[PDB]
């Protein structure tokens, strides 16, 4: 993947996170489970929604009747009408096919980017209070209860609150 | 001392939708939407809410001239398009040329 | 048939907001563009990599 996260350093997906595109799995003393990150998911949904509606609604065709009728002495204009009909067919077919190919590629990259960034937002909060153990997981150098966990998902993790305890276990 | 852990991850599900990308064919995605309308109702419908004029076994020439085989056709006071059948050949039962026939057909289409 | 439509083809009516169709090139109405494609499926979710 363009950014290295999806099918990358985070090897597989989670059939257990059913409520969102990206999110978190935690295990601490009081329990364990998945929780979707609601904010980043809604943003991506909004982004992708805008994209689909864009591809659909920017085509605003007028009322037309395609068929044309020509007699046996009007073959040249009949073939002109066919050249027209065939030209549009080739154009629309090429562009529709390529457009989808390109946006599908861009859509997957976008998800890849969002996961990478989610990971980076967490790494940046924790700094050295946890150890990067790969596969997208962080192992805390201090006890992390549900309150602590929620601060991390919300982005209000208190690095100095746990910094002393962590440094002890890190040493 | 196995510390508490928090992992980032992403949704996967049971979906089998595949899509093509510029770099890779048949990529399975968790969801996708179709842009290509590829089904019809097998019916000829009202357009703008107005029924078409159906000519049965007559063609436009036969209908508009009043070919005796077209007498049984009902003709509304308006219609949104015209339908002929591929076997509709009750036309000019007395042979000859219908001058500017196709122009007339286009004029009468709706 | 006693049905309404906004786009009629020789082999059946089409009721759709989608921008493309492979039913028939000869249509009447406010219709989707005819294309030769057999599949124009746009991805919205993500690559599916279950366990």
């Amino acid at each position: 993947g363009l950014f290295g996260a999806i099918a990358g350093f985070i090897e597989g997906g989670w059939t257990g996170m059913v409520d969102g595109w990206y999110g978190y799995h935690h295990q601490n003393e009081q329990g364990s489970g998945y929780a979707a990150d609601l904010k980043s998911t809604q943003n991506a949904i909004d982004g992708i929604t805008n994209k689909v509606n864009s591809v659909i609604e920017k085509m605003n065709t007028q009322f037309t009747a395609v068929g044309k009728e020509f007699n046996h002495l009007e073959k040249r204009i009949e073939n002109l009408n066919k050249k027209v009909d065939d030209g549009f067919l080739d154009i629309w077919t090429y562009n529709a096919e390529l457009l989808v190919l390109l946006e599908n590629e861009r859509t997957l990259d976008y998800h890849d980017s969002n996961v990478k960034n989610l990971y980076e937002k967490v790494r940046s909060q924790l700094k050295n209070n946890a150890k990067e153990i790969g596969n997208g997981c962080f192992e805390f150098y201090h006890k992390c209860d549900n309150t602590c966990m929620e601060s991390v998902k919300n982005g209000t993790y208190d690095y100095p609150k746990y910094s002393e305890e962590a440094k002890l276990n890190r040493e | 001392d196995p510390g508490d852990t928090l992992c980032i991850g992403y949704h996967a599900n049971n979906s089998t939708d595949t899509v093509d990308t510029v770099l890779e064919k048949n990529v399975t995605v968790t969801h996708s939407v179709n842009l290509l309308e590829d089904k019809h109702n097998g019916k000829l419908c009202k357009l703008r809410g107005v029924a078409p004029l159906h000519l049965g076994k007559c063609n436009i020439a036969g209908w508009i001239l009043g070919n005796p085989e077209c007498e049984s056709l009902s003709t509304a006071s308006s219609w949104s398009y015209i339908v002929e059948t591929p076997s509709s050949d009750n036309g000019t039962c007395y042979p000859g040329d219908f001058i500017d026939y196709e122009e007339l057909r286009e004029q009468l289409s709706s | 048939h006693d049905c309404n439509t906004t786009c009629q083809t020789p082999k059946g009516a089409i009721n759709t907001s989608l921008p493309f169709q492979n039913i028939h090139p000869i249509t009447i109405g406010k219709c989707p563009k005819y294309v030769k494609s057999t599949k124009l499926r746009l991805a919205t979710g993500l690559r599916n990599i279950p366990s």
Partner: antibody, heavy 123, light 109 residues
Framework: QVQLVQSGAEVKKPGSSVQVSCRAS????????INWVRQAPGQGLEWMGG????????KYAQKFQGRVTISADISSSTAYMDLSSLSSDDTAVYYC????????????????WGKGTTVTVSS | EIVLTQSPGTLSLSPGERATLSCRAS???????LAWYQQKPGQAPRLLIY???SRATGIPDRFSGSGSGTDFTLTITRLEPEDFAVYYC?????????FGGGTKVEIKR
């Protein structure tokens, strides 16, 4: 402006199918979940399923597994509830309903309801 | 699963009086993913409470939710005449979404 507009009330014979529409009229369709809730005459409310067109595929309740399908037309801003597990005790009022303030892509609660489409299954 | 039974099926109270409806769950309930609706006959529901105690905008102050786990309560502190209707509780921690049976508050007389 944000309103859901249900299809007309309908009467279908037993065994056959019904399809109820629900046109949103506000904002860009697709980034919110639409739920389908059903209410038999003088009865509780049961949730059949719902869709968020873009987030993922429809999710259904087992009661209607194989008898119902929900789809959405992303351009026309419309969701469809198709039911053809048809009997006489499928006669009810059918509501489509959504959440209004985000995040609303998932099936949660519901601020905004249609007026309902009453559907009577009778030969 | 996670089915919610409401108690009592009907509640007879005269105006001005405290009404407290309850809603019990077959399984615990994720934080506070419980809404409360109000249906008057012939209409679709109005959302009263979400979260578990968060009042929906529009809803007058007399309505207040509370509770957690498998026990929730909806309290109406002064029944006005408008307030007489059926009240359904709904959960949304997990699909399938399930409602309550509903409690009908009626006018005691």
């Amino acid at each position: 402006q944000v309103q859901l507009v249900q299809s007309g009330a309908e009467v279908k014979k037993p065994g056959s199918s019904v399809q109820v529409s629900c046109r949103a009229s506000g904002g860009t369709f697709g980034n919110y979940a639409i739920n389908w809730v059903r209410q038999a005459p003088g009865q509780g409310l049961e949730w059949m399923g719902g869709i968020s067109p873009i987030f993922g595929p429809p999710k259904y309740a087992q009661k209607f597994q194989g008898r119902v399908t929900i789809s959405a037309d992303i351009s026309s801003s419309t969701a469809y509830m198709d039911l053809s597990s048809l009997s006489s005790d499928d006669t009810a009022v059918y509501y489509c309903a959504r959440k209004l303030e985000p995040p609303y892509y998932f099936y949660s609660y519901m601020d905004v309801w249609g007026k309902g489409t009453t559907v009577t299954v009778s030969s | 699963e996670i089915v919610l039974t409401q108690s009592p099926g009907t509640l007879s109270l005269s105006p001005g009086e405290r009404a407290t409806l309850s809603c019990r769950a077959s399984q615990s309930v994720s934080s506070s993913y419980l809404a409360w609706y109000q249906q008057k006959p012939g209409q679709a529901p109005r959302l009263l409470i979400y979260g578990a105690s968060s009042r929906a905008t529009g809803i007058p102050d007399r309505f207040s939710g509370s509770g957690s786990g498998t026990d929730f309560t909806l309290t109406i502190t002064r029944l006005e005449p408008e307030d007489f209707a059926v009240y359904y509780c709904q959960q949304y921690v997990s699909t399938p979404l399930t409602f309550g049976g509903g409690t009908k508050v009626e006018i005691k007389r």
